[PDB]
């Protein structure tokens, strides 16, 4: 009666590291003296690996609140889920196909996904920030609003940010400057900011507040939240949201933020 939980490699939400020689996972500890709770997560050859982090801790607490058993596995194709006559890939496809009963991952809540699956109440709220080595007010700063080659800024090409920036007409002149400067991966752009070929990198705030530990600038823009992904026929999902609301109010989500994000 185990829940097939699917997740994805995305720090600081879900760290995955190889097992030791004996098949176990090294016992580490938080900044506070608490021990890090880890779970085995098969995935890509498919070998058992070590999963821990925000969503894992949330999974453990969720697994104990409503009392269920779970088996965690990384998503095969390594995608979050897009509409590619149209069929989902990534964790979206694995949830709808039946390979997973529930998605515990930093999965953005949007309209297209809600027409097939159904999210819980948001367990994490965030948006977008700017990563510079410099002052920037945010998306409304004049140096991005009126682009020049004196201050370069972009994002990952075809990324969730790039796909949305093109989608908006108001950001046409701003996005056209980015399209000529977009990079292949996130690690390339963050290195471009460090090696002084990119002056700003628009990306997810949690990934950039984490990578700074380079400093974030301005207020966040284009807010987006993460929810627990399930099918609309899931009997549990009612209390899945109630537990997310419960953990927000009793301070549990704050402890998760202090342990992983701050």
């Amino acid at each position: 009666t185990r829940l097939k939980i699917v997740t994805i490699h995305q720090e600081p939400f879900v760290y995955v590291k190889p097992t030791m020689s004996d098949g176990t996972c090294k016992e580490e500890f938080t900044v506070n003296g608490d021990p890090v709770k880890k779970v085995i997560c098969t995935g890509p050859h498919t070998v058992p690996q070590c999963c821990y982090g925000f969503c894992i801790d949330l999974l453990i607490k969720l697994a104990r609140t409503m009392n269920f058993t779970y088996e965690v596995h990384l998503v095969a194709d390594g995608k979050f889920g897009t509409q590619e006559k149209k069929e989902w890939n990534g964790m979206m496809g694995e949830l709808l196909s039946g390979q997973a009963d529930m998605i515990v991952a930093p999965l953005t809540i949007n309209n297209e996904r809600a027409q097939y699956i159904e999210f819980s109440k948001p367990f994490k709220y965030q948006g977008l920030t700017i990563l510079v080595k410099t002052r920037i007010t945010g998306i409304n700063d004049p140096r991005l609003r009126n682009p020049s080659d004196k201050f370069i800024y972009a994002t990952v090409k075809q990324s969730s940010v790039d796909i949305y920036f093109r989608r908006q007409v108001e950001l046409s002149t701003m996005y056209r400057h980015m399209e000529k400067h977009n990079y292949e991966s996130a690690a390339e752009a963050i290195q471009a900011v460090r090696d002084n070929k990119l002056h700003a990198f628009i990306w997810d705030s949690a990934v950039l507040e984490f990578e700074a530990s380079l400093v974030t600038t301005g207020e966040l823009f284009f807010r987006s939240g993460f929810g627990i992904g399930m099918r609309k026929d899931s009997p549990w999902k009612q209390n899945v949201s109630l537990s997310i609301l419960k953990s927000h109010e009793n301070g549990f989500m704050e402890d998760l933020d202090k342990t992983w994000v701050r």
């Binding site: 809600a114 950001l171 939240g225 609301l245 109010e249 301070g251 704050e254």
Partner: protein, 276 residues
């Protein structure tokens, strides 16, 4: 039928109530009609329905939802309570207006918490908020979870902080910190304006209230002296419906659609801007 009974509650900048133009008797510019039941005297409970004019962030959210989901409404202001509190196992306010089938949905600065979700269905949250702390410049606390709040007498002199009761904020403090809560009752503020006046004049060391309203109040403070710190118990504003209404599925799709269209920041770019 497609005519919906929708309740709201005034709280700038999300729901603003303006008096009707005497003649023309029409709501002008970015405005919808909204009626408020006003009593004649205190001897009896007899009154009249004053048709007024409503605007704001949540009002625009209502108009676009009425446009995308395609429905009409008779908007009115709740006069029995405010946002919603369960008094003697009987919900009042906007929540009560939905629970007892006097309003098919509620739009406004309605915080999504667990206890309200057990009696109404909330939509996808469309305005991020929670419980923040507003102080004057120089005051040093880390937030609601600070031990200067949990144990007020542990510090000298004791901090002076309060909240607007009956809402979701005082409710959350009541179950999380029973000592802190029954210490705040001495400093209870009748309104949000009364709270910030007390901060600037120096009778209140901190104001614990909804993060969305505080972030807006901190944005337009005269001289930019009132500041928010840092959100505890992060949640959001949600459109509450009755348990199992047909419209809950459609509203979540329309709200989520406004995000992908750049319409959501389009309204924050309009209503929630701050000078500070």
């Amino acid at each position: 039928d497609n005519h919906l009974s929708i309740v709201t509650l005034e709280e700038a900048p999300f729901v603003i109530v303006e008096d009707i133009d005497p003649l023309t008797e029409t709501c002008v510019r970015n405005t919808v009609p909204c009626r408020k039941f006003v009593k004649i005297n205190n001897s009896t409970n007899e009154g009249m329905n004053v048709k007024k004019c409503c605007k704001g962030f949540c009002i625009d959210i209502l108009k676009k939802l009425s446009r995308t989901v395609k429905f009409t409404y008779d908007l009115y202001l709740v006069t029995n309570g405010k946002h919603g509190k369960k008094v003697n196992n009987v919900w009042n306010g906007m929540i009560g207006e939905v629970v007892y089938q006097r309003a098919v949905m509620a739009v406004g600065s309605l915080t999504i918490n667990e206890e309200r979700s057990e009696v109404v269905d909330f939509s996808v949250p469309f305005v991020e908020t929670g419980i923040s702390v507003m102080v004057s410049r120089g005051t040093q606390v880390t937030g609601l979870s600070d031990k200067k709040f949990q144990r007020p007498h542990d510090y000298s002199p004791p901090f002076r902080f309060g909240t607007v009761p009956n809402g979701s904020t005082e409710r959350n403090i009541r179950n999380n910190y029973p000592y802190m809560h029954q210490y705040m009752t001495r400093f209870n503020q009748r309104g949000v304006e009364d709270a910030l006046v007390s901060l600037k004049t120096g009778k209140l060391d901190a104001f614990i209230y909804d993060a969305a309203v505080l972030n807006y109040k901190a944005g337009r403070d005269e001289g930019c002296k009132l500041v928010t710190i840092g959100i505890f118990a992060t949640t959001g504003y949600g459109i509450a419906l009755q348990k199992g209404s047909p419209w809950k599925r459609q509203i979540d799709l329309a709200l989520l659609q406004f995000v992908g269209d750049g319409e959501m920041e389009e309204l924050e770019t309009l209503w929630l801007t701050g000078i500070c």
